[PDB]
Amino acid sequence: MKIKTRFAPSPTGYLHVGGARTALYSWLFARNHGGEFVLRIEDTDLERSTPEAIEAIMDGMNWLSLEWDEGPYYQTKRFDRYNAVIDQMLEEGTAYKCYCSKERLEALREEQMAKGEKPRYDGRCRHSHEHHADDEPCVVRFANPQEGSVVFDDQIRGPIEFSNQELDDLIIRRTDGSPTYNFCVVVDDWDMEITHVIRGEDHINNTPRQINILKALKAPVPVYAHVSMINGDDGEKLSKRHGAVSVMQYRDDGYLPEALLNYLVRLGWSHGDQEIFTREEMIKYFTLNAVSKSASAFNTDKLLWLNHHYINALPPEYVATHLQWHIAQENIDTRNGPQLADLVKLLGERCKTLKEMAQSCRYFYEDFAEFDADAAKKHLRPVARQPLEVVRDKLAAITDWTAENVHHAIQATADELEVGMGKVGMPLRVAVTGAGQSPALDVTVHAIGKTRSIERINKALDFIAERE
Amino acid sequence: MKIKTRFAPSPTGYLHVGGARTALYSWLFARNHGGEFVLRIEDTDLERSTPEAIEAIMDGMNWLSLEWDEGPYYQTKRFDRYNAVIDQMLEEGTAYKCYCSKERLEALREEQMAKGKPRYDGRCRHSHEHHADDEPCVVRFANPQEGSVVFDDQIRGPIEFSNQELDDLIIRRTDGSPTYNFCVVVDDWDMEITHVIRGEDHINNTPRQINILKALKAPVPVYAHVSMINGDDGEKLSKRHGAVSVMQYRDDGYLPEALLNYLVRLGWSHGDQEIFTREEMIKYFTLNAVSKSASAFNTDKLLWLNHHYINALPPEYVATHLQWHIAQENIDTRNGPQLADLVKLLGERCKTLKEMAQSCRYFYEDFAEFDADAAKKHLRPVARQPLEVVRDKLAAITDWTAENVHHAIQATADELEVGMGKVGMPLRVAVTGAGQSPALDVTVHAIGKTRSIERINKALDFIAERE
Ligand SMILES: N[C@@H](CCC(=O)O)C(=O)O
Numbered sequence A: 001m002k003i004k005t006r007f008a009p010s011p012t013g014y015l016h017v018g019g020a021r022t023a024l025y026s027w028l029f030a031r032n033h034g035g036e037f038v039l040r041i042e043d044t045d046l047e048r049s050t051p052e053a054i055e056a057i058m059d060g061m062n063w064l065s066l067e068w069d070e071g072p073y074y075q076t077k078r079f080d081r082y083n084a085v086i087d088q089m090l091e092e093g094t095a096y097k098c099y100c101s102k103e104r105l106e107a108l109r110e111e112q113m114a115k116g117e118k119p120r121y122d123g124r125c126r127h128s129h130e131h132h133a134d135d136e137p138c139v140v141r142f143a144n145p146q147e148g149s150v151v152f153d154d155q156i157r158g159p160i161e162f163s164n165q166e167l168d169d170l171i172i173r174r175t176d177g178s179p180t181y182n183f184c185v186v187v188d189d190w191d192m193e194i195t196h197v198i199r200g201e202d203h204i205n206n207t208p209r210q211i212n213i214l215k216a217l218k219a220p221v222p223v224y225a226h227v228s229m230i231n232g233d234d235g236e237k238l239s240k241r242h243g244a245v246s247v248m249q250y251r252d253d254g255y256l257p258e259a260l261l262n263y264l265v266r267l268g269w270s271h272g273d274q275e276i277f278t279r280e281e282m283i284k285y286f287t288l289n290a291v292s293k294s295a296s297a298f299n300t301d302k303l304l305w306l307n308h309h310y311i312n313a314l315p316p317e318y319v320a321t322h323l324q325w326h327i328a329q330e331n332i333d334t335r336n337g338p339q340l341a342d343l344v345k346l347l348g349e350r351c352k353t354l355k356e357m358a359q360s361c362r363y364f365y366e367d368f369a370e371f372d373a374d375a376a377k378k379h380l381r382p383v384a385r386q387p388l389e390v391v392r393d394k395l396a397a398i399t400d401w402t403a404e405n406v407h408h409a410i411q412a413t414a415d416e417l418e419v420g421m422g423k424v425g426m427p428l429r430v431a432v433t434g435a436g437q438s439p440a441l442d443v444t445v446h447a448i449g450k451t452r453s454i455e456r457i458n459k460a461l462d463f464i465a466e467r468e
Numbered sequence B: 001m002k003i004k005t006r007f008a009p010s011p012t013g014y015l016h017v018g019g020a021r022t023a024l025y026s027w028l029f030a031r032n033h034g035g036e037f038v039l040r041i042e043d044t045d046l047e048r049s050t051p052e053a054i055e056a057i058m059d060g061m062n063w064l065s066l067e068w069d070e071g072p073y074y075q076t077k078r079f080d081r082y083n084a085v086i087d088q089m090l091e092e093g094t095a096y097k098c099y100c101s102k103e104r105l106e107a108l109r110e111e112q113m114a115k116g117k118p119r120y121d122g123r124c125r126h127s128h129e130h131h132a133d134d135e136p137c138v139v140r141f142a143n144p145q146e147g148s149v150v151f152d153d154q155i156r157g158p159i160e161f162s163n164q165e166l167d168d169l170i171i172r173r174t175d176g177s178p179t180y181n182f183c184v185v186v187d188d189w190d191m192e193i194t195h196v197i198r199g200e201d202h203i204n205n206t207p208r209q210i211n212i213l214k215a216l217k218a219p220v221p222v223y224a225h226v227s228m229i230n231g232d233d234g235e236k237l238s239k240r241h242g243a244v245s246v247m248q249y250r251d252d253g254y255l256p257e258a259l260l261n262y263l264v265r266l267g268w269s270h271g272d273q274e275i276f277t278r279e280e281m282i283k284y285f286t287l288n289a290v291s292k293s294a295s296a297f298n299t300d301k302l303l304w305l306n307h308h309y310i311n312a313l314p315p316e317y318v319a320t321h322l323q324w325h326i327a328q329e330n331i332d333t334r335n336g337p338q339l340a341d342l343v344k345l346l347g348e349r350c351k352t353l354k355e356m357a358q359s360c361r362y363f364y365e366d367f368a369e370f371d372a373d374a375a376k377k378h379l380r381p382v383a384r385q386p387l388e389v390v391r392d393k394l395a396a397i398t399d400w401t402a403e404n405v406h407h408a409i410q411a412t413a414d415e416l417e418v419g420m421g422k423v424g425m426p427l428r429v430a431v432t433g434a435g436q437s438p439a440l441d442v443t444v445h446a447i448g449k450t451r452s453i454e455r456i457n458k459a460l461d462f463i464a465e466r467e
């Protein structure tokens, strides 16, 4: 059993869309097999691993509701654990102590690159008989095996083979006490007992280096699965120029977490039949073998309509909880108006993003100072007060305030008084909304209270009464 | 129950979208209950019943694939049938022969409008005087005066009209021609129509048609009047809102499946489901589910409906409708890829068949000059060497497939170390002429190896203008 996946991002300042999909594959697989999902932070890069950068990762994880069972663990700590394993490998002989200077190390790399070889450190200090010990500063390296090769069955890329002759005895501790990054990964995956590694594509070169270290210090080597990169619109790697790149920028743009997670799953992974999956539906049907090795392009137009569906498909109460954030972005006093769960029922089919719903809704909660200049010139003086005064005093006739009673009440006008339906509904729309674009008239004027209805109808009557 | 629905449009010049939805409900109701769908023509208005105007109805029904079991019947014909029933009805006590002149009617209507509703009095209802022998006159129908008329409308509920509001309407003019309200009754009786599904404006004519059906011993059918289709501002659908004729949507690049699916959703609602096949619309259709309220026309959703059906329907069927818009663009489709294959390429990109006929000429015809704008960014001298290795590698493969094309562009940008976008984009501008196209694996494959080199070298002959 003990299935344990991991997500160990290096802080970039935010949560990259490609990194969120990687975390989703590691999170779906841990939940698929009833395992644990561990969170880890690669904050050794002290410049870009700011406290705001680390929070932007966890805040992005929480919005997508990708909760973790263990963590988060930080690589800036556990240094005493890292040096404890290094001292262990020095005693067992699996790691030696190099004494070459940086002058000879750079002269070795320039000679191999010139000679048409691969930059690898030869075993000069691997089995050196030259003494130079104790008080002298030095670095320690990992005695990489020389014979054979390492082959790991990648669930995404298939069988991958790396000859041991192209892997060097990598350094695992610098001149100072700090250990190198690759050694900080093998012990973390060992101490946390990771069984399935799901990371990006560019980490494939360090995978055979990490396996030979785990096999050395006697550790259960996990099965690796490297997901391909996400390409943009023109076939290049996904960047900020292709569109929104951070998961929180999509939250600012007016998206739902279910819409983004359902689209990132469809990038590479496929089920054939479906395009829309629920959270629990992704857990069951997810298979690493189904993820494609080819890179997928990012279609922002498809993601938008994916968001439009989830706005009207998800429960109106839950969509309202995400609508509240963009409501505060537009700064709207939502005390005197309809419910938020009832607001998404009105503006559901109209707009395709929550930002577009927070906008074009202020007339449901707040009064407007002026009218729309073009919409005001539409309902001029002729036959404007005649249909407005009869419908204003007819809406307040009922005690049961429902949109059904309003429809037949608005139906009374333009039918009892011979006139077109657009000759009263359009002036009524501009009266209560201020513009000439809104949902159904019977439903729009019902969400607005009967008080603010006659207040804004008489407001237009005082406006059309300006022939002087 | 031997269910029989009908669709009898009056030729307005074309096929209104609202009229097609009415024909769609009657066709669905007949196919749901294993009945017959009959077709009738109200071509009595000889001014707008042009042979071109009546044909636009026939081919519009055929475009939506709304085949009929009976018909088409024409009200221009069966005039002897219309004159034979009134003569039989004149023999019975249900229809008399009025004789009042046009002067008495206007003087009575203006007197009835002056007193405390214009309803013709029964002056000739029980007159024993022959009044004339062959002089001009008008035949009318004796309307019942006691009680009411009630018809259970399946959409608008129960509607009641008092018989005192229905006057003895005219059923035959002075020139012997019969009126419209009587022609509908005799047609629906000889054709054995069990369910009537028509527009909303015929709700006032329903009680008059039933009192004639209650007379002469006739089975009264069940009526169901659909609500009008309103536009963006709440008024009836007109040309100012957008496309109105069904054939205008074929010109604009739509499919019959996309238009029928959207008109079905207008009013009739079946849960969260939005996309139905023709067979699903036959099964799940319920006449009571049609809402009494009027629904506005959302051209944005209809565009999304068509985008789905382009990629959901078989590519060979979409190719048969795409052929009409290729002829509109006047594209020589002799050298390029197959039409059914073209739908696979431009499928997820465009949302209408006109948008597919456009932005596809470079697959079939060569372009004289480039877009310049996209060339100025990708035809720089730095790309003259990526283009010299792709064409030498594109021809190295004997098996011409999109996969072997990708491996050719993959050998490039690796031998000459550079980003893959720095070779595929100049290849995209050289082969397509602009900076937008599907995947380069299928774009240069569908165009061909011969026309590729002819366009790569065309770019090489152009990018060599650094002087
Ligand atoms: N921190 C690395 C991943 C390290 C790993 O998964 O081994 C990244 O964000 O790309």
Ligand SMILES: N[C@@H](CCC(=O)O)C(=O)O
Pocket: B007, B008, B009, B010, B042, B184, B197, B198, B199, B202
């Ligand atoms: N011909 C009428 C319909 C007649 C009927 O359905 O009874 C129309 O086009 O509106």
Ligand SMILES: [Zn+2]
Pocket: A098, A099, A100, A124, A125
């Ligand atoms: Zn050394």
Ligand SMILES: [Zn+2]
Pocket: B098, B099, B100, B101, B123, B124
């Ligand atoms: Zn008379």
